[PDB]
């Protein structure tokens, strides 16, 4: 086997075996010392050479002394068989695992609209007339310069301008110092409208030049002269981005004043600005003060309610900041205080709705994980089709992305919409970004409605060009969803899908990992020839914390189809039922029985279609189980209801008793004896490794003693006649 | 155990999660012994003065600090709280991790070298550190940590790996430097042990060996025994 071929000696270049991965310290860095470095070779023992030569000599005898007798008596199918990468292996921030990549979308032009209803945060250069001549000269230097520096600021998180750009461009260095000589002596009223221009429009959150430090003194001296909301503008001006540019004490002051003077902020929009700015608070105690206030001030319009959902969506209080011990599901009770306070207004007048205020509801609900707000959507179903032609490029994606996952990732719509929205997509196709395009390609496969005409002209080349690269890591997944829903099998396309993940410098996020592990067992069932090892290092960090059983406490509540048949399995009849059992940390089977590898999966309003067919999820899952020899009883919840009540219990018994026996035989027939075969071959691979090689060679001939063992080949015979041929 | 045996037989299949999980951590650590985590640490502090004497600080529960500098650099001595100092130990990474000190707008890199405690009283006397600068050589301690290998044939059975040195002293010339060293001893044997030059050949370009500290490259770290039965049979006979 392998070990006999081993070298008697290893050089210094061969002690450390090769690796699939480089480390982050083999990078090319500034300073370097390979040049002056000398090479070291491990010495050979002086007495070993006296052993190396002799064995070389006795081997040399038998070569000639036998040749003298003759005169007397006569692969890597990813990157081809050659060429393959080597993934850099590093330690990783949490950030890579919870970051929505900002490539593949002109973000800020898109993102500034959705807030634009908040007037007070809208930056205005001309509001600062004294410096507007200066500030604008700076931005010319930004875009006009080489690269795309300002455009890389929020986008390429690996890139910074507070150190690379501003600290080196000497024209700008003059300009920021022209400011400092002015900042101290301005009115206290112009400061926050300046800070917005720094943080967003210029990306100066740091205190490099020492600018904010002067703003603090000119600010803190006149805190009491401000109104309420003109302090909130500082909060959003500084704390909305990565460095909270201000200090602690200057923010504790703002943080302490405001929650005393909530009795005087006049409007509900003024709470909207407030909550959206104070969303990063770690203290729970004061979110309640806000929401306790909003439960007091009734709303009498419709733009107000939109202005709360879109804000309350992003500005939730995460559960990791909450304590470990707490009232059950208390995060939800924070929601419905609002949603019960809003449900009237958003429901009474939803016909009164327009394209700019249109988008923010679909988002506000999808981010809120509910299934109640259908009535607004029906009033929206009627809205789009009328204005279908006059729509913008922007209002198309968010609809296609919104209705796709309307009621908790179950869609909501009709064939009238999406068939109409093809044309609206075909109009603005060149204007969408790669994120928007994939999100269309999700919604159709989500319903199995892709035109074969539509995949050819636009999707097919787009994927061919950009699947291998030039595609952000987050957009592969909406593609990874759909293709398996399309049941595609073209290998040349799955290559690029894998080559990207292997080549991509960024690790896989847990936010987007569920497809990447589905698509694994998709390809493995089809193609066993691949090696997904590189495709696991990129998935290494996510799989550690990954568990499917976390879904249990929710499904136990919000699925009556699950329990009611579950009641029958346990109380009335008798099997070794288990319940939710996680299929290799990828699925959780609805109901199962073991050791027989049995499954009772269920269709429902989540998983059926208007046609009555299963959703393209519910056929995906039932492939993978069957691929791993895991019996199935695809139950349809309608048909079980239709059975007469006395015959509902035995009908399950008649099926399950049969599906058991099919597997009960299969275990006897194939697996049970076949494990001994692998076992007894596993036992050799150990005994192969326990060998004294020098003792076992003992010359050039190999004479192993052989143990006889009773083995019942009577069951299996393909392997007998497969081994008895090669072995002799 | 915590559930009756009669129920465990029904759920014997469940325990794959147990073993499939331990794949993940112990492999992750075993390959992450080498790499510094990419996470910035900061220590607010204050300057030294001739006024702040030791015993004055030590009722206030502050601590002195000392830094030794390198070529052409001056030394720096600072004041800090005790609970900062112990928290700096309490990381995994304390032997090498880069810690900063913010006095004001300034930051000073450092490493841990050691701490002295008053042994009879058992309170913190000082916390000593070593400067780090990018463009110049800097002393660090690279511990050696040996992986297990069931791929060699002598290592598996009746032999014993011998780690004669715990770490290596080097000089680093760049920002990110490796936390430690990890070895796969398959190709080693009784005949050849590992020697420091086998490491010197395999390092980044920014690293060099501090010959002032070590004795010779022909020095050896990992040694492997012979078999035990071949002794034991001879021991009895």
């Amino acid at each position: 086997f392998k070990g006999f071929d081993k070298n008697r000696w290893a050089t210094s270049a061969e002690v450390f075996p090769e690796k699939p991965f480089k480390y982050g310290y083999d990078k090319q860095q500034k300073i370097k010392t390979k040049q002056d470095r000398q090479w070291y070779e491990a010495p050979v023992g002086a007495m070993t050479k006296k052993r190396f030569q002799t064995a070389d000599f006795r081997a040399y005898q038998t070569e000639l002394e036998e040749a003298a007798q003759k005169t007397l008596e006569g692969k890597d199918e990813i990157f081809g068989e050659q060429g393959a990468p080597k993934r850099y292996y590093d330690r990783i921030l949490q950030k890579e695992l919870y970051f929505h990549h900002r490539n593949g979308k002109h973000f800020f032009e898109q993102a500034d609209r959705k807030i634009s209803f908040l007037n007070q945060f809208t930056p205005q250069i001309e509001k600062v007339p004294e410096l507007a001549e200066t500030l604008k000269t700076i931005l010319k230097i930004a875009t006009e310069s080489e690269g795309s520096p300002l455009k890389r600021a929020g986008i390429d998180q690996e890139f910074i301008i507070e150190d690379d750009f501003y600290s080196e461009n000497e024209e700008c260095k003059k300009l920021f110092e022209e400011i400092k000589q002015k900042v101290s002596n301005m009115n206290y009223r112009l400061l926050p409208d300046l800070c917005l221009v720094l943080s967003f429009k210029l990306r100066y959150n740091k205190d490099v030049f020492g600018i904010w430090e002067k703003i603090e003194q000119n600010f803190m001296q006149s805190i009491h002269h401000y109104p309420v909301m003109e302090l909130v503008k500082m909060r959003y001006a500084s704390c909305a981005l990565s460095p909270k540019s201000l200090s602690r004490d200057c923010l504790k002051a703002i943080h302490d004043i405001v929650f005393t003077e909530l009795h005087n902020v006049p409007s509900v929009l003024d709470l909207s600005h407030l909550l959206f700015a104070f969303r990063h608070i770690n203290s729970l105690k004061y979110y309640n003060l806000i929401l306790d206030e909003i439960c007091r001030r009734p709303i009498k319009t419709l733009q107000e309610a939109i202005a709360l959902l879109f804000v309350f969506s992003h500005s939730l209080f995460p559960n990791y900041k909450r304590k470990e011990i707490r009232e059950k599901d208390q995060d939800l009770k924070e929601k419905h205080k609002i949603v019960d306070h809003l449900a009237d207004a958003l429901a009474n007048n939803a016909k009164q709705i327009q394209g700019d205020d249109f988008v923010r509801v679909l988002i506000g609900l999808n981010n809120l994980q509910l299934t109640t707000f259908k009535d607004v959507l029906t009033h929206i179903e009627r809205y789009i089709i009328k204005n279908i032609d006059t729509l913008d490029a922007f209002q198309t994606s968010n609809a296609l992305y919104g209705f796709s996952k309307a009621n908790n990732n179950a869609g909501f719509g009709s064939e009238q919409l999406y068939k109409a929205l093809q044309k609206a997509a075909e109009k603005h196709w060149s204007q969408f970004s790669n994120a928007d395009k994939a999100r269309t390609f999700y919604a159709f496969a989500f319903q199995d409605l892709v035109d074969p005409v539509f995949r050819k002209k636009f999707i097919q080349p787009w994927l061919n060009e950009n699947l291998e690269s030039n595609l952000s890591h987050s957009e592969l997944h909406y593609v990874a969803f759909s293709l398996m829903f399309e049941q595609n099998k073209d290998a040349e396309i799955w290559k690029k899908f894998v080559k990207n993940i292997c080549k991509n410098q960024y690790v896989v996020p847990v936010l987007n990992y569920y497809p990447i592990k589905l698509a694994r067992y998709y390809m493995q069932s089809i193609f066993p020839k691949w090696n997904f090892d590189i495709y696991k290092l990129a998935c290494q960090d996510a799989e550690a914390t990954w568990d499917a059983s976390r879904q249990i406490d929710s499904i136990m509540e919000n699925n009556k189809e699950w329990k009611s048949i579950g009641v029958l399995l346990q109380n009335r009849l008798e099997f070794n039922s288990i319940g939710l059992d996680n299929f290799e940390n990828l699925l959780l089977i609805d109901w199962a029985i073991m050791p027989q590898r049995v499954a009772i999966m269920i269709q429902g309003a989540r998983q059926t279609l208007p046609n009555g067919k299963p959703t393209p999820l519910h056929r995906l899952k039932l492939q993978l189980l069957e691929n791993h020899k895991f019996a199935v009883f695809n139950l349809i919840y309608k048909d079980f209801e239709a059975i007469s009540p006395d015959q509902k219990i035995p009908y399950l018994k008649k099926t399950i008793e049969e599906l058991i026996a099919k597997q009960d035989t299969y275990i006897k027939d194939v697996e049970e004896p076949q494990q001994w075969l692998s076992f007894m071959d596993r036992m050799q691979e150990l005994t192969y490794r326990n060998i004294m090689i020098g003792e076992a060679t003992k010359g050039g001939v190999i004479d192993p003693e052989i143990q006889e063992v009773q083995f019942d080949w009577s069951k299996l015979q393909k392997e007998l006649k497969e081994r008895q041929k090669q072995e002799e | 155990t915590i559930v009756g045996s009669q129920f465990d037989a029904q759920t014997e299949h469940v325990n794959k999660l147990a073993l499939d999980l331990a794949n993940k951590k112990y492999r992750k650590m075993a390959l992450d012994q080498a790499v510094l985590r990419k996470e910035k640490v900061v220590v607010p502090a204050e300057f030294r003065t001739e006024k702040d004497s030791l015993i004055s600080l030590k009722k206030e529960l502050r601590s002195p600090v000392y830094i030794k500098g390198h070529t052409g650099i001056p030394d720096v001595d600072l004041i800090a709280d005790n609970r900062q100092v112990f928290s700096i130990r309490r990381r995994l990474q304390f032997q090498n991790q880069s810690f900063y000190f913010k006095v004001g707008n300034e930051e000073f890199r450092c490493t841990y070298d050691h701490i002295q405690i008053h042994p009879m009283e058992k309170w913190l006397v000082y916390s000593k550190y070593r400067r780090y600068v990018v463009g110049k050589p800097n002393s660090i301690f690279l511990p050696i940590n040996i992986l297990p290998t069931f791929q060699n044939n002598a290592i598996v059975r009746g032999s014993e790996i011998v780690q004669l040195l715990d770490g290596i002293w080097v000089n680093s010339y760049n920002d990110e430097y490796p936390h430690s060293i990890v070895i796969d001893p398959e190709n080693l044997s009784k005949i050849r042990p590992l020697r420091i030059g086998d490491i010197h050949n395999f390092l980044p370009d920014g690293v060099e060996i501090d010959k002032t500290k070590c004795l010779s490259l022909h020095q050896k770290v990992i040694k492997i025994t012979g078999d035990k039965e071949r002794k034991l049979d001879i021991a009895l006979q």
Binding site: K95, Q157, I223, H224, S242, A253 | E39, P44, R83, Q84
Partner: peptide, 30 residues
Amino acid sequence: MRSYNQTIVENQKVFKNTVNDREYYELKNT
């Protein structure tokens, strides 16, 4: 990834947790 995050290392025993109304920041200017 060139993130600005950084672990501050300091004892929270010193940091006072009290409230200061508009008045406290009004009077201190004078």
